[PDB]
Design a protein around this ligand. Structure first.
Ligand SMILES: Cc1cc2nc3c(=O)[nH]c(=O)nc-3n(C[C@H](O)[C@H](O)[C@H](O)COP(=O)(O)O)c2cc1C
Ligand SMILES: Cc1cc2nc3c(=O)[nH]c(=O)nc-3n(C[C@H](O)[C@H](O)[C@H](O)COP(=O)(O)O)c2cc1C
Ligand SMILES: Cc1ncc(COP(=O)(O)O)c(C=O)c1O
Ligand SMILES: Cc1ncc(COP(=O)(O)O)c(C=O)c1O
Lengths: 211, 211
């Protein structure tokens, strides 16, 4: 089938190829940078930049302080959305799915893998809490350094990670002539579908949408 | 007051200075590019890249098709969030507030100001609708071109814009040493506040948060 213009009928394997091309682009510094959208049960959205830390069949992984705004929103409403935008390539990737907090064990393993300065940073910074000035931090940070000198920084109880499980993945490719390519993968049932709806690996269904 | 490190105690005037420095950066192509987060009344978030089209005291303006997913979510739940990320500067700006659809008249004025090709593009592209292949569009687009040759492209009824009214604005500045600067402006009452809470212009209140 002279196909669409994709590399894989697997949304995650497609993200991979696009992600690698981004990593290999000199003009993109943080290719794993993504904007995470979350909201309260009520319907009040929020969004902030984040770094994607590992991905695959299980989903997209990221870490934060469970007590940060995003944490308190994901825990009281396990639904999130991700947006990857790589301007140099004019590409955008959107991921929608339910979030599942990670196992404290894995978080721990990943935590101690970070640079000591990043670990210490996660302890002084009671993320999302109010403070007096930028020095307050420079100070605490300094103190905890001498404290944990030749020591293991314990992973804050409230520090961990989540993994988004891909329910909907979109691929956008800006074109010069404005007729942007746009394919949406979504997991449907009808194991019996639209004329323009096509079969993707697993229970994946894709189709092109008007830009 | 040897102040924080800002340019204005006005969140919008602060965004301005940061926005201008971005526009003047050779490494940032789309400085007005932002990720818009929205959700259903239920609490299901979504997010996609967008271009900021004008801003000020009234708020942040952007245009889309009212019948696109984002439209149907903003209309049934007038709350949105914006994220501006300028990696070359390691800066992030977050805007939270209620959305108000724009006057069809202004949309019209703005619509006809766009390049004809962009206007025609908004008519062939029944944004968010399913289609067969990329040619379907190349075709419609071509046909509407000869149609509107030496003619005014009417603004689609379902085409318009919204304006976010700044209820919460955040400024993030990544630092090398990881002790990122982060100030949050929010409109409060107590016209009588925290020790680390400071007065911003109007009914604006700001404070620094642990990164
Ligand atoms: C490029 C970039 C990457 C970031 N990565 C993370 C991250 O992995 N985890 C995190 O908690 N915050 C990260 N942040 C900071 C968040 O955007 C945010 O300021 C913080 O998590 C608090 O948001 P919240 O109050 O919505 O929870 C990053 C910021 C930038 C600009
Ligand atoms: C850099 C960039 C700028 C964009 N600007 C807009 C815009 O101003 N309005 C719009 O409707 N879509 C814009 N889009 C496309 C949206 O991200 C999205 O694909 C489209 O609006 C449909 O999203 P929705 O289905 O959530 O409504 C832009 C995409 C990129 C990558
Ligand atoms: C808020 C924040 N924390 C941490 C990091 C990087 O830390 P790590 O050593 O875990 O990759 C970044 C990188 O941009 C960041 O923006
Ligand atoms: C989806 C989309 N529409 C339109 C535009 C630009 O159109 P305009 O001439 O209104 O600035 C862009 C620019 O990136 C875009 O991504």
């Amino acid at each position: 089938f002279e196909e669409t213009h994709l590399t894989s009928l697997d949304p995650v394997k497609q993200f991979a190829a696009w992600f690698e091309e981004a990593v290999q682009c000199p003009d993109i510094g943080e290719a794993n940078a993504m904007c995470l959208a979350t909201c309260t049960r009520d319907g009040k959205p929020s969004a902030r930049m984040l770094l994607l830390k590992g991905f695959g069949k299980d989903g997209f992984r990221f870490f934060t302080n469970f007590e940060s705004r995003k944490g308190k929103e994901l825990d009281s409403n396990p639904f999130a959305s991700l947006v990857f935008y790589w301007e140099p390539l004019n590409r955008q990737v959107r991921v929608e799915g339910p979030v599942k907090k990670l196992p404290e064990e894995e978080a721990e393993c990943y935590f101690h893998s970070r640079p000591k300065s990043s670990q210490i940073g996660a302890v002084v910074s009671h993320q999302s809490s109010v403070i007096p000035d930028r020095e307050y931090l420079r100070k605490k940070n300094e103190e905890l350094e001498q404290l944990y000198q030749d020591q293991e920084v314990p992973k804050p109880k409230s520090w961990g990670g989540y993994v988004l499980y891909p329910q909907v993945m979109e691929f956008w490719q800006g074109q010069t002539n404005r007729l942007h390519d746009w394919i949406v993968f979504r997991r449907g049932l009808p194991t019996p579908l639209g004329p323009m709806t096509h079969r993707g690996e697993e229970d994946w269904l894709y189709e092109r949408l008007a830009p």
